[PDB]
Design a protein around this nucleic acid. Structure first.
Ligand SMILES: C[C@H]1COc2c(N3CCN(C)CC3)c(F)cc3c(=O)c(C(=O)O)cn1c23
Ligand SMILES: C[C@H]1COc2c(N3CCN(C)CC3)c(F)cc3c(=O)c(C(=O)O)cn1c23
Ligand SMILES: [Mg+2]
Ligand SMILES: [Mg+2]
Ligand SMILES: [Mg+2]
Ligand SMILES: [Mg+2]
Lengths: 487, 245, 487, 247
DNA sequence: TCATGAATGACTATGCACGT
DNA sequence: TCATGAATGACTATGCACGT
């Protein structure tokens, strides 16, 4: 029996937990804004073909595929993570297209795994765009049977777009979601002004990113908290719902709440007001009625007494309820395997750096494959020029190995190329078919030259990020929801 | 007029209207369907009571055991009326009791278990036409450019498809016609526009003609006598298709 | 609003449920002895490649695949069905190879889906043998997306082997498991004596199938119940565990139970004896100790008082505990979509009929494919005999259609064959490869001749069942476990 | 000293042993219902008892005492061990002289260990001081040789060592089934748990030692206490050198 | 003291037929 | 009353950091 000191055990054991949680569970990667469970669910669905160009697959199949190949954890909590990525009130830009009962902004829980179907959204398809072209590093999964991506291509700034919240050890993150169009403008500026320093960049990006854009709309009051978050990485952003005062035929007034701030439970909100009248700290209120429906959206009617001022009651709601609540922003993300609190210019810059990396790697992959393809075509063209011999050469050979070994000697060709000649069908010996091979060689050599030109010009590389991102924003970009007002 | 909760079952999602004559209770199969129904309902006049698991057979089980069943207590408490001799139509809190179950066989089974509870404990609810059956959709035709259509049978599906194609509309062969295998697979919007919207929903009002003939049929099908039930099925299952011909 | 009478609704609704439960849930198909959930789980695993030639897949993946394509029900109960098929104390011949915690014969529950892995067993591979050769009818699944088998090939009599228990409506089944080697002898006799009447067949099959063979070993006392079950379809078979009286140095004797009858919970058994003593209904017992372990198996030691006779205590245990319990046999199965109570001769005959159908259908499929392969080869040989010409024609063609149409004119060929010539690689123009094409034609014409001979001779067909089944029994057949004794 | 074992006032989930002698008895505190289930099956019921813990244990360092005593999982441990807590602690009433903590080899098992060691050190310290607390090391790999008996490995290094030795010895493995990798105790069956963590003739146990009580008192309070800042700076300071603690 | 969200599943109740 | 075995998922409690 080996002896171990409790101090050694406690320190080694708790630090191993803290570090893995920090880097490998609770906090987002800065480049794609995803936690491991997110990245593994999405790739599992992607690899399974659960894409928007096919019907929703049973969500159980997505959970199981994630469990069995990438995420060595439970089906229950994995389903919860998948469900969240499909709720329009949780993600500003949903990554999962859910079909069925996925819950509500209130206390109505989502339906069980068996009842729901799911697939990737078009924007999630941009997260994974060209992941098969060596655009990102892959590592073996939890048992080395298959490969998984370390990070996604993420062809739109997902971290800033959808935000992130996570409780780790010794630290936690809380990044709010943002409007895609505003983020795109910030990225476009960063690409044009690639030499600008952090001081100039921060000024430019802050001018274009006016503030967080929550899926639940609502209001943002003040500008200091937003500014703090972008300059410090921490700031307190004041949110508000929307209240519209209605008058009655008798002449009674009632307040109608149609929007609430981010991450405020609709049912807990109504209950809080109900309990705060019971005791009676919100006098002036006469009646509370939830006239909400799937067709009118949120609609909480607060009828007030005849001896009550509308704004007085509203101000009391701001004070004593989450009708007004603050978002504690803390821009914490994993950068190169290290947790770091980041300024807004750093968040954009690091994302742009990722996009440039992705496109160079894609260009490299396409360039390598083009050379291999051109290499084989060159061999075929050599065979066609001496086609009369090549056929005769293969026929007179007792085996295919004798035929192959000869083709190398006869045409001065590689073994890979020689193999391709052997693999050639009698189809491609037709007149027009011989011509296609010639043209295809000319076609690729034009592509190879183009690809080489991209790798040699950082200007083109940046241009591709801009142009490709522009396409995404024009297609998937939407209006701002959260209205920004002053004090 | 009767008070709505804002002393009743915890899972009851009561309505806002205090008038039973205007109120409706949707007795729903499953938490999933009940959950989405609670969202898609008209909260003014429609209340939801989700039932969990197969209802206890009151024909087989002794009376005291039935009263211990949580799912039965929920129904009796929500309806407001008593049971048996202590039954009172005046306390009926919903003048419309819609049973909404899956189109599958287990939904059919749960309906017979509920109809047995109602017929034995609260018969006047059936006699006075307060019990209804919601017919869920079976298909959803998702046209490429047009609004989606719902079908309640294989025939209607074929008919709406044929009409649409003849009118020049088109459907994907991937997404295509979504087939419902239960209420739990539907969202709030779909349930409203098929089973809860009063201007489109397909309800069937349960009528009671011969009470004596019904009394024996309930006892044969739901009673403890297996032999009587076994012979009845082998005798009549052969001709179920031809009951309405 | 349409009116409906309660009698109309009740009758239609309950009969629809009863019929679907009877035919489509609770009772086994006579041909493969499977309920729908079993058949769908097994085929899902099969189609997914979860076979003995690959590592155990996470059991969640099997559940999800079954759930998502074939079985429109819940993940929880489907997992329960998969688990049962992997327990050696439940199935006499397990169809699922489980890896992990799949429970125990006692009250220890199986581990959740999360922790367990699963794949098909070698015998389950015989259930699905050559299912892809049109050996069984396939129908569209629950949403017409894919096809599923109506019944499995079942190349060993699974219904009788593994038995079945199921509660339906108006009826229930309870078929005990049997020893595979004994069942094979019965099948071998039925194949040899294919003209024998029911009177003779029942006598022969009963002589070879000595009785049930439970996975839990134990004893069968008497022969009347067994005989009744085989001649009537109903019978009460008396089972017993194994008891061994041990003596100690102190003078105390103790009873050691090492086996229990089928479907007797080990923990409930110990608790029953313990509670019978508490109240005092099994005097003579001094102490109850469970010395069971994973290494010695079941071992319940019952120390008795010195003024007690062992045989008296054992008889008391037989009477007041499940140490002696009866198996209520009810040989009910679905035959051609109809529930039927069957004699043992009917059960064998129906299975043999299924095997003959499978092999005739397999032979038909192989003959059709053999004719197709031969048809194409005939075209290839024609091309080789006039090879110099074949090349010239393809060359001068503007398209491949111009090349194709000519090949028809030159060699008098179908469109399929000419296309096959077109798809031909230069690989096969080598000497040995040209010879391979020739010999391959000769091989098929020999296989076609063989296949045609099978279809024309019922003698060979019965011979195929016998010989193929014989291989299965020699490989997977095991010793009898349940010992049969007299009164 | 002898105490009665439950057989048809102790925790319901406790699978007690048969031996009434604490000196010969052992309590396996197991992570998860699945692993506890298999442990209950693979154990030696004579001397080994199983107490499965469900979910992460409550942090007694952060939570107030009254809330800790309301926690069902803590009550189970305290009740099963028989000793009191704090001032009412009495080692004489100890029902097991070996308290084996068995958690997954993964990161969450490590966490649960610190939560249990925190419970023991704060409520029942003498159990640690007198060497009644142990840590079972679960296997990480199972090498399934085609013809030979399977071998278990407790580290990546040992796996590589046993693989080369076997291959050098002429043995062979499938490249499909091959080397099974354990990701938790719940993935093991009863037999595997016996032959790696419960068989006293093969199990790899580590006895928890307590040297400097004051230094331990401070480490527990930093890592497990309410002060986040103190914890954050400790991790960023020492995580960089975790690999080199035993070099 | 409550919310966040990614981690660590047993228990609860019925239908149905049949035998104790 | 209990076991059988496929059918019809919500609730329960902790860690972790932070702000009202
Ligand atoms: C129908 C759902 C919901 O109701 C269920 C149960 N009860 C919960 C409390 N009620 C008072 C009565 C019903 C239950 F004890 C078990 C299950 C269950 O095992 C299950 C499954 O898929 O395996 C699905 N369900 C169950
Ligand atoms: C770790 C397992 C077993 O213990 C669990 C809970 N218990 C903790 C101990 N007891 C106080 C009773 C409650 C619990 F309330 C929830 C879950 C849960 O949600 C879950 C999951 O996979 O999502 C997995 N587990 C849970
Ligand atoms: Mg959970
Ligand atoms: Mg259903
Ligand atoms: Mg269940
Ligand atoms: Mg673990």
């Amino acid at each position: 029996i080996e002896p171990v000191d409790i101090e050694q055990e406690m320190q080694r054991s708790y630090i191993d937990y803290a570090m893995s949680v920090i880097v490998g569970r609770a906090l987002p990667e800065v480049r794609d804004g995803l936690k491991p469970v997110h990245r593994r669910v999405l790739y599992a669905m992607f690899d399974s073909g659960f894409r928007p160009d096919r019907s929703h697959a049973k969500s159980a199949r997505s959970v199981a595929e994630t469990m069995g190949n990438y995420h060595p954890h439970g089906d229950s909590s994995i389903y919860d993570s998948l469900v969240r990525m499909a709720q329009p009130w949780s993600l500003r830009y949903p990554l999962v297209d859910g079909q069925g009962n996925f819950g509500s902004p209130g206390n109505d829980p989502p339906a069980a795994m068996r009842y729901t179907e799911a697939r990737l959204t078009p924007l999630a398809m941009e997260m994974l765009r060209e992941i098969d072209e060596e655009t990102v590093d892959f590592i073996p999964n939890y048992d080395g049977r298959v490969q998984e991506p370390t990070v996604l291509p993420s062809r739109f700034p997902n971290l800033l777009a959808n935000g992130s919240g996570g409780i780790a050890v010794g630290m936690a993150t809380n990044i709010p979601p943002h409007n895609l169009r505003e983020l795109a403008d910030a990225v476009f500026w960063a690409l044009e002004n690639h030499d600008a320093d952090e001081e100039e960049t921060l000024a430019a990006v802050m001018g274009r990113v006016k503030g967080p854009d929550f899926p639940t709309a609502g209001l943002i009051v003040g500008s200091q908290g937003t500014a703090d978050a972008y300059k410090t990485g921490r700031g307190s952003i004041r949110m508000r719902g929307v209240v519209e005062v209605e008058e009655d035929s008798r002449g009674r007034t009632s307040l109608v709440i149609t929007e609430l701030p981010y991450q405020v439970n609709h049912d807990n909100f109504i209950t809080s007001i109900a309990e705060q009248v019971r005791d009676g700290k919100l006098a002036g209120i006469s009646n509370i009625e939830d006239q909400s429906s799937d067709r009118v959206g949120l609609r909480i009617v607060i009828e007030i007494k005849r001896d009550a001022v509308a704004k007085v009651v509203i101000n009391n709601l701001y004070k004593h309820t989450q009708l007004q609540t603050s978002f504690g922003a803390n821009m914490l993300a994993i950068v190169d395997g290290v947790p770091r609190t980041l300024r807004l210019d750093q968040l954009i810059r690091y994302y742009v750096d990722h996009q440039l990396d992705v496109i160079v790697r894609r260009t490299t992959y396409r360039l390598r494959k083009a050379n291999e393809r051109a290499h084989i075509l060159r061999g075929l063209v050599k065979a066609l020029d001496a086609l009369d011999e090549v056929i005769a050469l293969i026929r007179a050979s007792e085996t295919v190995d004798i035929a192959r070994a000869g083709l190398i000697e006869l045409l001065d060709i590689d073994e890979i190329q020689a193999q391709a000649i052997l693999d050639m069908q009698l189809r491609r010996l037709a007149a027009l078919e011989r011509q296609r091979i010639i043209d295809d060689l000319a076609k690729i050599e034009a592509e190879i030259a183009d690809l080489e030109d991209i790798l040699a010009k950082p200007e083109r590389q940046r241009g591709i990020v801009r142009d490709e991102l522009a396409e995404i924003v024009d297609r998937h970009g939407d209006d701002r929801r959260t209205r920004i007002i002053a004090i | 007029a009767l008070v709505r909760r804002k002393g009743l079952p915890g899972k009851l999602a009561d309505c806002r209207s205090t008038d039973p004559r205007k109120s409706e209770l949707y007795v729903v199969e499953g938490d999933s369907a009940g959950g989405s129904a609670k969202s898609g309902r008209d909260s003014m006049f429609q209340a939801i009571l989700p039932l969990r698991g197969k209802i206890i057979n009151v024909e087989k089980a002794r009376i005291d055991r039935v009263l211990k069943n949580t799912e039965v207590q929920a129904i009796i408490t929500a309806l407001g009326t008593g049971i048996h001799d202590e039954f009172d139509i005046g306390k009926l809190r919903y003048h419309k009791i819609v049973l909404m179950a899956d189109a599958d066989v287990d939904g059919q089974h749960i309906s017979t278990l509920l109809l047995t509870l109602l017929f034995r404990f609260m018969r006047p609810l059936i006699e006075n036409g307060h019990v209804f059956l919601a017919q869920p959709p079976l298909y959803k035709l998702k046209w490429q450019r047009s609004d989606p259509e719902f079908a309640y049978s294989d025939r209607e599906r074929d008919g709406l498809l044929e009409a649409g194609l003849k009118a020049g509309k088109k459907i994907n062969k991937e997404d295509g016609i979504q087939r419902y295998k239960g209420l739990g697979e539907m969202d709030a919007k779909e349930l409203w526009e098929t089973t809860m919207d009063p201007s489109v929903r397909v309800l069937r009002q349960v009528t009671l003609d011969d009470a004596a003939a019904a009394d024996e049929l309930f006892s044969i099908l739901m009673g403890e006598d297996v032999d009587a039930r076994r012979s009845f099925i082998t005798r009549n299952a052969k001709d179920v298709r031809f009951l309405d011909v």
